[PDB]
RNA sequence: AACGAGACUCUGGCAUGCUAACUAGUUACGCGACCCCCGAGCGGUCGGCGUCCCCCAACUUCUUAGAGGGACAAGUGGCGUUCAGCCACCCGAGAUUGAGCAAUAACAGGUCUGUGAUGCCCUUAGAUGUCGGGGCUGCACGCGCGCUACACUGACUGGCUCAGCGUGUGCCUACCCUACGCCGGCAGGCGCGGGUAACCCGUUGAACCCCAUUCGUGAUGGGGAUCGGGGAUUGCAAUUAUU
């Protein structure tokens, strides 16, 4: 049964062909599993066929939905980036847009040296956690002199 | 003289204090006692509470 | 004229409450007033549990204080004057009695 | 038929016990026939009262173990039901007799106590025989199915089978004879 | 036969298959992009979940004729796993429970009773017991 | 000249009251056939009195049952104890005495607590430990 | 002879015996109404489902809570210097329910930071008796009580069906538990009633469990730390992120 090609290289990442298509495309960053089901539902695709059982034209139908979600009627409260701080847009950053958007956000913070920027710099915990008995990476110290 | 002699004390531990010892820190609000946890063991009888459990 | 009228009794000591109730029943049935017997509402128990120690030292013992509340009702079918009269009599100890206009 | 009872399906009256030592301590026939391995059963109130408990219920109780099963008994009954249904296929024989066989051939008839590592050899009471056999063959199953695709009913079934005919491929038998050799040495 | 005479799961499947055989019973637009409660972690598998949910809702109204939305969300509550903290009981979604009860009034099966709440119309109970008999006759119950 | 009787059964604060009367068959509980009480893994438990006594005794009585309290399993034993505690008091009142001695010995020899309630109830927690007998950990050094 | 033990007080287990209940019910029918034939019948009648509506019907089994009753090693058989008692068994709701209370003499135990209980010492207007801001949360490291997990005796998605102890509008103080309708995916918002409480939330539709679907031995859909972005509620104020 269905012995044609399985693995597919969706943008910049190797989507394995074996897993169910829902749990197949999650190997993309910025695309969790709750977002993926919506994308596939709005793409009309069956949800009982692996990644190997999709031809070369459905996959474009899915990509264009992942990239332009606002227009395929996926509401504005699903998108991971909202009222984007620099320009007011709403969208899902996908693969390296996620890396660069985190990078730019940390740079934006450090630039005006906000209390979070310095915590990202010093490599500490940024939210309000106690730090006396947690994290605890370093090496043991001795009382001897 | 002064118009700055208080700032809102309308909830939390600043609001309330024991009806006997005037302390804060560990008072019983249940049933409207409003009584310090040490002061209540002292009058726990005259109110009527009796230990028999 | 003849009215329904309900007396509600509350206390914490049971014997006073029960003896009060039985005496009111007596005084009502000596006039043949068609009394509906005492209904015993569920007793209530107030619980307060605190550390024994004044400061923070010791093994961690607790007290378990509790107070009990008993409550019952009796119902009468009669004019008001006889009931407010006999109610007004024969209560020596510490017991709470409240009588209302009508409850039926 | 109505004088006779089944676990829905399986008959009791065709069973046999060949160890005359264990005839007092395995309950299966007659007044110990019950429809289900689930009774309230205040057994653990006196000393020997545990001997009256129907053997299939004892096999169920000893199965809900290791923490995230404490109490869940209806799962255990639905496990045992399935295990017997598989056993009737893998052999074509009565499941109850296979259980009775696998209990009889797992009780270590000699153990070594500790006195000082210095041990001594002693013989085990007829009640401890069954109390150990049950433990061993329920641990074999729970152990064989911890990260495998097999299901606990499948492993419990093949465990009962490979033990009812002492085969050195079953956890129970290995551990029993290994507990006996250590006694044999420091006799 | 009434509804209490028959197994309460295949009855639900029959009622759902019947409700989704009339073209009536308008479903909300967001039917395919909704978690269904605060404590779930995924959207329902069954693409027709609204039909099943409306079927079960009607059955529940049959057995206890005075529900209202504030208990449909309790009848449907479940257990929330708060990450690294102990779980806790959590309610359903108010909005879908409301839109389900509204969709049933359009079939004249439900009406807002005295006091406040909802109950089945006389015509709703017939629609139920008919497929109850249908179930009992299919499976021979 | 009505001919009826009522008796209860308890198991861990789960009371089930059975009312048996003149009739023909028809043993129900909360309105369902006893074939369909929910935890159906335990079905042979609540079929035990009829499967043990034979449907010849369950031939002139109709026995309805109302249950409330406890948990799922602790109500199977309430029911299972109440109906058999009933067929033994409908006999003892409207039949001869020596016929009920047959029922009681077919019953009590198979499984007690089809007539005598378990006296076990939960023990009460104490300060110091999580439950009734355990205690919190003790860190010496 | 006195204290401690025991006795005692509360609680759990049994009463189809008593007392008696629209702020608990049940059974009946006076009912009537709805619905299906689901069975005789036809569809009514015979019946079946009802937390549908009634009764100025009958009663107290279920509910509530008062007075008494019951268990005494009392009966039977062994072991006991035939004593004090132990062991097994019968009848039984039960032959060992769980707590509270507790002696003499002490400890350099803890507490002056519970007290308008308190001796002595100190400070007392440039205060050690008030407002604004920060800290008690600061992190190379050592320890203690814990929570969630390492999965198939499982995770996810639907479906089905069961509790018990409780608290509830606040006397300065100023806030309570929530039904039902509507709006919003969600947290939440608006509207309009009940409750000073066996009366309303509430027949407290609790989770595990139970039944059916997807996954497949792979750090995988196990696990859910850390981190980015956005939306609400509390408050005078949320940044070191309250929730
Ligand atoms: Mg109560
Ligand atoms: Mg867990
Ligand atoms: Mg516990
Ligand atoms: Mg006692
Ligand atoms: Mg009681
Ligand atoms: Mg009712
Ligand atoms: Mg008494
Ligand atoms: Mg003697
Ligand atoms: Mg007996
Ligand atoms: Mg005692
Ligand atoms: Mg002492
Ligand atoms: Mg002091
Ligand atoms: Mg001093
Ligand atoms: Mg001051
Ligand atoms: Mg300050
Ligand atoms: Mg601190
Ligand atoms: Mg400690
Ligand atoms: Mg689930
Ligand atoms: Mg805080």
Cβ neighbourhood burial of B20 (10 Å; 0-12, 13-18, 19+) = middle
Residues of E in contact with A74 (CB under 8 A): 33
CA-based nearest distance F127→chain C, Å: 7
Taking CB atoms and an 8 Å limit, are E7 and F36 in contact across chains?
A: yes
Whether the CB-CB separation of E124 and E25 falls below 8 Å is answered with no
Determination technique used: cryo-EM
Residues of F in contact with E7 (CB under 8 A): 36
Distance of CA D137 to the CA centre of its chain: 6
Residues of F in contact with C60 (CB under 8 A): 127-128
Question: What's the alpha-carbon Rg for chain D, to the nearest Å?
Answer: 17
Other Cβ atoms within 10 Å of D105 Cβ, number: 19
Alpha-carbon dihedral F84, F87, F93, F97, rounded to 10 degrees: -80
Q: How remote is the CA of residue D41 from the centroid of ligand 10, in Å?
A: 25
Q: Check residue C2 and give left, alpha or beta (phi > 0: left; psi -120 to 50: alpha).
A: beta
Ligand nearest to the CA of F131: 3
Domain C2-102 falls in which CATH fold? Alpha-Beta Plaits (3.30.70)
Whether the CB-CB separation of E27 and E76 falls below 8 Å is answered with no
Cα distances (angstroms) measured from residue E105 to each of C48, E64, F115: 51, 17, 50
Q: How far apart are CA A83 and CA D47, in angstroms?
A: 74
CA-based nearest distance B10→chain C, Å: 26
Taking CB atoms and an 8 Å limit, are D36 and F54 in contact across chains?
A: no
Q: How far apart are CA E1 and CA D81, in angstroms?
A: 33
Q: How many alpha carbons lie under 13 Å from residue F137 in its C-beta half-sphere?
A: 3
Where do the domains of chain A lie? 1-75, 76-140
Taking alpha carbons only, the member of B23, B49, B50, B51 closest to residue B36 is B23
CA angle E33, E35, E41 (to 5 degrees): 125
Tokens 């006893």 sit at which residue? F34
CA-based nearest distance E6→chain F, Å: 8
Domain membership of residue F118 as a residue range: 1-141
Q: Which domains does chain B have, with CATH numbers?
A: 1-53 (4.10.830.10)
Chain F residue with minimum CA distance to D3: F52
Taking alpha carbons only, the member of F35, F43, F75 closest to residue E4 is F35
Exposed e or buried b for every residue in E9-29, given b needs 16+ CB within 10 A? eebbebbbebbbeeeebebee
Residues of D in contact with F38 (CB under 8 A): none
Q: How far apart are CA D61 and CA D59, in angstroms?
A: 6
Domain A1-75 falls in which CATH fold? Helicase, Ruva Protein; domain 3 (1.10.8)
Cβ neighbourhood burial of D99 (10 Å; 0-12, 13-18, 19+) = buried
Q: How far apart are CA C67 and CA C44, in angstroms?
A: 8
Q: Do chains D and E touch (3 or more CB pairs under 8 A)?
A: no
Taking CB atoms and an 8 Å limit, are F42 and D36 in contact across chains?
A: yes
Other Cβ atoms within 10 Å of D1 Cβ, number: 5
Q: How far apart are CA E120 and CA E110, in angstroms?
A: 4
Cα distances (angstroms) measured from residue E96 to each of E29, E53, E57, E67, E72: 11, 9, 11, 15, 10
Residues of E in contact with A41 (CB under 8 A): 32-33
Q: How far apart are CA D130 and CA D58, in angstroms?
A: 10
Q: Please tell me whether residue E79 adopts helix, strand or coil conformation.
A: strand
Other Cβ atoms within 10 Å of B8 Cβ, number: 7
CA-based nearest distance F38→chain E, Å: 10
Contacts of A19-23 with C-beta under 8 Å, sequence gap 24+, read A19/A50, A19/A51, A20/A47, A20/A48, A20/A49, A20/A50, A20/A51, A21/A45, A21/A47, A21/A49, A21/A50, A21/A51, A21/A54, A22/A47
Chain C residue with minimum CA distance to F136: C60
Alpha helix positions (H), C43-91: 80-87
Spanning CA of E83 to C1' of G165, the rounded length in angstroms is 29
Tokens 């005259």 sit at which residue? B46
Looking only at the bridges linking them, the beta strands covering D119-122 and D111-114 are antiparallel
Q: How far apart are CA D86 and CA B46, in angstroms?
A: 72
* C-alpha dihedral sign at A103, A105, A110, A112: positive
Other Cβ atoms within 10 Å of B12 Cβ, number: 7
Q: How far apart are CA E34 and CA E25, in angstroms?
A: 19
Chain D residue with minimum CA distance to F39: D74
Cβ neighbourhood burial of F85 (10 Å; 0-12, 13-18, 19+) = buried
Residue closest to G186, CA→C1'?
E38
Q: Which nucleotides of G are covered by protein (CB under 7 A)?
A: 9-10, 12-16, 19-23, 26-28, 34-38, 48-52, 61-67, 93-94, 96-101, 109-111, 114-115, 130-132, 137-149, 151-154, 156-168, 170-175, 178-188, 198, 202-203, 205-211, 213-218, 220-221, 224-231, 235-236, 239-243
Q: How far apart are CA D101 and CA D18, in angstroms?
A: 9
**Read out DSSP for chain D?**
-TT--BSSS-BSTT-----TTTTTT---SGGG--SSS------TTSSGGGGGS-HHHHHHHTTS-SSTTTT--HHHHHHHHHHHHHHHHHHSS-HHHHHHHHHHTTS-S-EEEE----EEEEPPPHHHHHHHHHHHHHHHHHHHTSSSSS-HHHHHHHHHHHHHTT-SSSHHHHHHHHHHHHHHHT-
* Interface membership of B50 toward C (CB under 8 Å): yes
Q: How remote is the CA of residue A141 from the centroid of ligand 15, in Å?
A: 39
Taking CB atoms and an 8 Å limit, are D39 and F11 in contact across chains?
A: no
Interface test mutation site (partner B, options C48, C66, C68, max chain B beta carbons within 10 A): C48
CA-based nearest distance F46→chain D, Å: 11
Q: How far apart are CA D176 and CA D140, in angstroms?
A: 12
Q: How many residues does chain B have?
A: 53
Q: How far apart are CA F120 and CA F70, in angstroms?
A: 13
* C-alpha dihedral sign at F75, F77, F81, F84: positive
Whether the CB-CB separation of D127 and D25 falls below 8 Å is answered with yes
Q: What is the CATH number of the domain that holds F23?
A: 3.30.230.10
Taking alpha carbons only, the member of F23, F28, F92, F94 closest to residue F62 is F23
Q: How far apart are CA A35 and CA A54, in angstroms?
A: 19
Spanning CA of E117 to C1' of G51, the rounded length in angstroms is 14
Q: Report the run of H or E that residue C5 belongs to, with start and end.
A: strand C3-11
Cα distances (angstroms) measured from residue F81 to each of A14, B6, D150, F104: 64, 70, 40, 13
Which nucleotide is the nearest neighbour of D69, by CA and C1'? G153
* C-alpha dihedral sign at D46, D51, D53, D58: positive
Cβ neighbourhood burial of D43 (10 Å; 0-12, 13-18, 19+) = middle
Cα distances (angstroms) measured from residue D186 to each of C95, D121, F54: 81, 7, 60
Q: How far apart are CA A28 and CA A10, in angstroms?
A: 8
Cα distances (angstroms) measured from residue A123 to each of A112, A126, A136: 17, 9, 13
Domain count, chain F: 1
Q: How far apart are CA D17 and CA D55, in angstroms?
A: 13
The answer to whether B44 is a known ligand-binding residue is no
Resolution (A): 3.3
Q: Please tell me whether residue E13 adopts helix, strand or coil conformation.
A: helix
DSSP state of A60: H
Q: Do chains E and B touch (3 or more CB pairs under 8 A)?
A: no
* Interface membership of B31 toward C (CB under 8 Å): yes
Taking CB atoms and an 8 Å limit, are B41 and C67 in contact across chains?
A: no
Tokens 């021979």 sit at which residue? E140
Q: Do chains A and B touch (3 or more CB pairs under 8 A)?
A: no
Taking alpha carbons only, the member of D26, D186, D174 closest to residue D111 is D186
Q: How far apart are CA F94 and CA F87, in angstroms?
A: 11
């Amino acid at each position: 049964p269905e012995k044609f090609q399985h693995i597919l290289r969706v943008l910049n990442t190797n989507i394995d062909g074996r897993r169910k298509i829902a749990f197949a495309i999650t190997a993309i960053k910025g695309v969790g599993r709750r977002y993926a089901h919506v994308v596939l539902r709005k793409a009309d695709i069956d949800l009982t066929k692996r990644a190997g059982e999709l031809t070369e034209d459905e996959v474009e139908r899915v990509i264009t939905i992942m990239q332009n979600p606002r227009q395929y009627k996926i509401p504005d409260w699903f998108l991971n980036r909202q009222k984007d701080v620099k320009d007011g847009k709403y969208s899902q950053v996908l693969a390296n847009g996620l890396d660069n958007k985190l990078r730019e956000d940390l740079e934006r913070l450090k630039k005006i040296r906000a209390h979070r920027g310095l915590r990202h710099f010093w490599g500490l915990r940024v939210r309000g956690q106690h730090t006396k008995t947690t994290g605890r990476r370093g090496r043991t110290v001795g009382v001897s002199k | 003289q002064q118009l700055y002699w208080s700032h809102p004390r309308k909830f939390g531990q600043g609001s309330r204090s024991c009806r006997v010892c005037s302390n804060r820190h560990g008072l019983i609000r249940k049933y409207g006692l409003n009584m310090c946890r040490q002061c209540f063991r002292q009058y726990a009888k005259d109110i009527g509470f009796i230990k028999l459990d | 004229a003849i009215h329904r009228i309900r007396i509600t009794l509350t206390s914490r000591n049971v014997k006073s409450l029960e003896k009060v109730c039985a005496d009111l029943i007596r005084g009502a049935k000596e006039k043949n007033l068609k009394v509906k017997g005492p209904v015993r509402m569920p007793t209530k128990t107030l619980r307060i549990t605190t550390r024994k120690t004044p400061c923070g030292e010791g093994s961690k013992t607790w007290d378990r204080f509790q107070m009990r509340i008993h409550k019952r009702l009796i119902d009468l079918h009669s004019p008001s004057e006889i009931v407010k009269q006999i109610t007004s009599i024969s209560i020596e100890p510490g017991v709470e009695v409240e009588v209302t206009i009508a409850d039926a | 038929t109505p004088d006779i009872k089944l676990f829905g399906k399986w008959s009791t009256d065709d069973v046999q016990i060949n160890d005359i030592s264990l005839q007092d301590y395995i309950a299966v026939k007659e007044k110990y026939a019950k429809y289900l391995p689930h009774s309230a059963g205040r057994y653990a109130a006196k000393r020997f009262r545990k001997a009256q408990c129907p053997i299939v219920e004892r096999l169920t109780n000893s199965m809900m173990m290791h923490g995230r099963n404490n109490g869940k008994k209806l799962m255990t009954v639905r496990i045992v039901k399935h295990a017997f249904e598989i056993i009737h296929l893998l052999t074509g024989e009565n499941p109850l007799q296979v259980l009775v066989n696998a209990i009889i051939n797992s009780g270590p008839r000699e153990d070594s106590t500790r006195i000082g590592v210095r041990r001594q050899a002693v013989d085990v009471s007829p009640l401890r025989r069954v109390n150990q056999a049950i433990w061993l063959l329920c641990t074999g199953a729970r152990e064989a199915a911890f990260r495998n695709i097999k299901t606990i009913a499948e492993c419990l079934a093949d465990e009962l089978i490979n033990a009812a005919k002492g085969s050195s491929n079953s956890y129970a038998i290995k551990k029993k004879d290994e507990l006996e050799r250590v006694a044999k040495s420091n006799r | 036969v009434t509804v209490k005479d028959v197994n309460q799961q295949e009855f639900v499947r029959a009622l759902a298959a019947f409700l989704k055989k009339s073209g009536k019973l308008k479903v909300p637009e967001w039917v395919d992009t909704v978690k269904l409660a605060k404590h779930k972690e995924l959207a329902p598998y069954d693409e027709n979940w609204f039909y099943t949910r409306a079927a079960s809702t009607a059955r529940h109204l049959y057995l206890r004729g005075g529900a209202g939305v504030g208990s449909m969300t309790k009848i449907y509550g479940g257990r929330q796993r708060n990450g690294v903290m102990p779980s806790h009981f959590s309610r359903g979604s108010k909005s879908v429970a409301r839109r389900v009860l509204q969709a049933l009034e359009g079939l004249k099966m439900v009406e807002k009773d005295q006091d406040w709440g909802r109950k089945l119309t006389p015509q709703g109970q017939r629609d139920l017991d008919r497929i109850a008999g249908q179930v009992a006759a299919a499976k021979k119950k | 000249p009505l001919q009826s009787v009522q008796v209860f059964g308890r198991k861990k604060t789960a009371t089930a009251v059975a009312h048996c009367k003149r009739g023909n068959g028809l043993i129900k509980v909360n309105g369902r056939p006893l074939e369909m009480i929910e935890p159906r893994t335990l079905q042979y438990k609540l079929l035990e009195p009829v499967l043990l006594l034979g449907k010849e005794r369950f031939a002139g009585v109709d026995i309805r049952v109302r249950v409330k309290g406890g948990g799922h399993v602790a109500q199977i034993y309430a029911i299972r104890q109440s109906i058999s505690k009933a067929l033994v008091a409908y006999y003892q009142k409207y039949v001869d005495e020596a016929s009920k001695k047959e029922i009681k010995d077919i019953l009590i020899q198979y499984d007690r607590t089809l007539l005598v309630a378990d006296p076990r109830r939960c023990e009460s927690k104490k300060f110091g430990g999580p439950g009734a007998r355990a205690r919190y950990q003790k860190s010496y050094r």
